[PDB]
Design an enzyme around this catalytic site. Structure first.
Site, PDB file in Angstrom:
ATOM      1  N   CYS A   1      76.745 -26.943  72.478  1.00 20.40           N
ATOM      2  CA  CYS A   1      76.698 -27.989  71.457  1.00 20.40           C
ATOM      3  C   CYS A   1      75.390 -28.774  71.543  1.00 20.40           C
ATOM      4  O   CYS A   1      74.729 -28.770  72.581  1.00 20.40           O
ATOM      5  CB  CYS A   1      77.893 -28.929  71.600  1.00 20.40           C
TER       6      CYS A   1
ATOM      7  N   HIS B   1      78.200 -25.875  78.120  1.00 14.74           N
ATOM      8  CA  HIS B   1      78.457 -27.124  77.411  1.00 14.74           C
ATOM      9  C   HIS B   1      77.081 -27.692  77.087  1.00 14.74           C
ATOM     10  O   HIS B   1      76.114 -27.399  77.785  1.00 14.74           O
ATOM     11  CB  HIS B   1      79.226 -28.095  78.300  1.00 14.74           C
TER      12      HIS B   1
END
Lengths: 4, 230, 217, 4
Positions: free
Chosen positions: B130, B88
């Protein structure tokens, strides 16, 4: 579809 | 002459960090699809001659220690170094299972004055995470010899498919399977930019996340061309 | 199929912003040597085939309007677009004669949706400025290439009589191999030539290109 | 040499  | 010397005993080490599961308190969900990525990369870089090591569900402390421990090794007999991060992410930071840590601090360990045995040799970092929260609606370190291949441009989201794997990794592996030993690193990543840009388009029941796009981002500080063979 | 299509009437427009003299209220000093840079850049890019124009000591309103007007022009017969910035700089911004303005605001006008006639065509931005501590669908962000004189956070060196290191190197490589090498090979050789001058500075390249770029055939 |  999935986001990171 | 204009290419990186690849006449060493070995290509180098390839560290893969496969963070699938996160602690509830971080607010992060399960990254279904990452194992597929981890598996395809694992085979890919092994095929290139890298000595690959896969780590799973790491903690911020663990990620910092691994890379530090790696930069303290003797890379004299190695031609290069590679590291892929699957997790993440947010602007400038990458997630562990217990929190967040700055990408720059993770890659700093390999600067020239901290890892003399990798000076003048290329250091590759592929990041699948991301870098913000923006959506692409669509239309119609202070050192040399580093290269970062982010799955998306800064400030945007990066897509992953629970059954097939992330787009960036999928693309990357296809191109490496067939052209890994005959194209230059920038030729490979350029083709990957094109595959992620054309081949994929997201579909969801959520109208805000339907029919969106993505474009990888390569940052280069390399000083020579890079080929993984002779 | 793996190269950008250069079969066009024009290679493209090339704007060169030359900021040498800044107003006193900014606190910045004169940039001696930038004149030698801009001239060297003018000859090189003209040889490649760009229709290049040079604007001196621009203000923040000028630079913004200059690149807004450019994204509003018709690029249907152009193979690509290029912009070169030669000024002072801090963390993520570029200097005008009257202050600062964001780089990401200068390039935004060329996004796939904001400039339809340049879709699937390369938009090149070469920036020579500092950075540090301040006191059938296609993506819209694709097909951009940035070539900074230095990485985020460090200084960029310039000589009054010889000009800046990055520019000197860029022109040398373009003079000889501008027609026979791909854009990433040229910029990679620039990285090396700049690195080999203190033996610090090291240029950075950000590529979102989808095909290989050559300035011929 | 001077700084930018």
């Amino acid at each position: 579809d999935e986001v990171x | 002459t204009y290419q990186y010397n690849m006449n060493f005993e070995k290509l180098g080490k390839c560290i893969i960090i496969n963070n699938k599961n996160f602690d509830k308190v971080t607010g992060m969900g399960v990254r279904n699809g990452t194992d597929k990525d981890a598996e395809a990369l694992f085979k890919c870089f092994r095929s290139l001659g890298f000595d690959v090591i896969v780590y799973n569900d790491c903690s911020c402390a663990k990620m910092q220690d691994l890379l530090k421990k790696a930069s303290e090794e003797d890379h004299t007999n190695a031609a290069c170094f590679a590291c892929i991060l699957l997790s993440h992410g947010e602007e400038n930071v990458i997630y562990g299972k217990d929190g967040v840590t700055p990408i720059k601090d993770l890659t700093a360990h390999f600067r020239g004055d901290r890892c003399k045995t990798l000076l003048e040799k290329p250091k590759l970092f592929f990041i699948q995470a991301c870098r913000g929260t923006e959506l692409d609606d669509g239309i119609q370190p202070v050192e040399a010899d580093f290269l970062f291949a982010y799955s998306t441009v800064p400030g945007y989201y990066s897509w992953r498919s629970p059954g097939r794997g992330s787009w960036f990794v999928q693309a990357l592996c296809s191109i490496l399977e067939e052209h890994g030993k005959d194209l230059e690193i920038m030729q490979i990543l350029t083709r990957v930019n094109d595959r992620v840009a054309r081949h994929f388009e997201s579909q969801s029941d959520d109208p805000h996340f339907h029919e969106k796009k993505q474009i990888p981002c390569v940052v280069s500080m390399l000083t020579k061309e890079l080929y993984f063979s002779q």
